[PDB]
Amino acid sequence: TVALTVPAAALLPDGALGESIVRGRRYLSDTPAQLPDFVGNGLACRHCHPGRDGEVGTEANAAPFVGVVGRFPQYSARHGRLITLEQRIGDCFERSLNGRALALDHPALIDMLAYMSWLSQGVPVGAVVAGHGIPTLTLEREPDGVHGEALYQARCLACHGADGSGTLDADGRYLFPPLWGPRSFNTGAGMNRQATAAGFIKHKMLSDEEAWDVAGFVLTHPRPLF
Numbered sequence: 001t002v003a004l005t006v007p008a009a010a011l012l013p014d015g016a017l018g019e020s021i022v023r024g025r026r027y028l029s030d031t032p033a034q035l036p037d038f039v040g041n042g043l044a045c046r047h048c049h050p051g052r053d054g055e056v057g058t059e060a061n062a063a064p065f066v067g068v069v070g071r072f073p074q075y076s077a078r079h080g081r082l083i084t085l086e087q088r089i090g091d092c093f094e095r096s097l098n099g100r101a102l103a104l105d106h107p108a109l110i111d112m113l114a115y116m117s118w119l120s121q122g123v124p125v126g127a128v129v130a131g132h133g134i135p136t137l138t139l140e141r142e143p144d145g146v147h148g149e150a151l152y153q154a155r156c157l158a159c160h161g162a163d164g165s166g167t168l169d170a171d172g173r174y175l176f177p178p179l180w181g182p183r184s185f186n187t188g189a190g191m192n193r194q195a196t197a198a199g200f201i202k203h204k205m206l207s208d209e210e211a212w213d214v215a216g217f218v219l220t221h222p223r224p225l226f
């Protein structure tokens, strides 16, 4: 692999590319408000692809975008063929954001691509960045939703709510995003898979057993059908 580094915002170029990158950051950070026609729930991309210092997609094991551009096109089993990064983004609009894919030449999509390309600056095409994706966590027993409920009350509820509906900020963006219900990701999202949710929770915060069980509890709840 190659190491994950984040480029310096102060070194963004003047001109069309720089402006595009800045818009791309905003689309990824503030998606429901910036792209209402395409977002069907309360989630922004940053809610599963966090970053520090206002950036999005810069954290190891939380599916960083650093280095993503050089890994596409790639095979997708759901499509049964190679897909582009633009298509992958559309899939997450449809699934994680319970919405509608942007046209493949939509200016907002291109800005998001520009931003991801900026994050990927210096990464060799084809190279894998350390910390890419969300590593799965799989245990050799069923997740215990009863244990998970107790864990949720003790470790998660204060932020994500008794009803999993999250906490809004003063500007109507989710400070703490919804984990289930009509404003959360739909059943088509990767986060709806036990081992992915467990892995995400494990790394973004728990023991392996606790992460496994609390993920199980979270995933017992209704959410929109894809």
Ligand code: HEC
Pocket: 043, 046, 047, 048, 049, 050, 051, 152, 155, 156, 157, 158, 159, 160, 175, 176, 177, 178, 179, 184, 185, 191, 197, 200, 201, 204, 205, 206, 214, 215, 218
């Ligand atoms: C107790 C173990 C839990 C569980 C099961 C989850 N969380 Fe959180 N969470 C918080 C914030 C600000 C985010 C957005 C991403 C970030 O900036 O770090 C999240 C994100 C999640 C997700 C993915 C998004 C979604 O809506 O599904 C999941 C599955 C998730 N969390 C589960 C904030 C908090 C907290 C405030 C300090 C606490 C405590 C937790 N989360 C605890 C948990």
Ligand code: HEC
Pocket: 028, 031, 043, 044, 045, 046, 047, 048, 049, 063, 064, 068, 071, 085, 088, 089, 092, 093, 096, 097, 112, 132, 133, 134, 135, 185, 189, 190, 191, 196
């Ligand atoms: C949680 C419900 C998510 C939201 C909201 C978004 N994404 Fe996502 N994304 C998520 C997971 C669990 C994964 C799989 C990680 C892995 O192990 O590969 C992804 C993956 C992507 C990718 C591919 C990353 C890679 O191949 O390394 C891209 C390009 C991506 N996601 C983009 C993206 C955008 C633009 C979003 C807002 C529209 C978005 N995602 C929201 C979980 C979630």
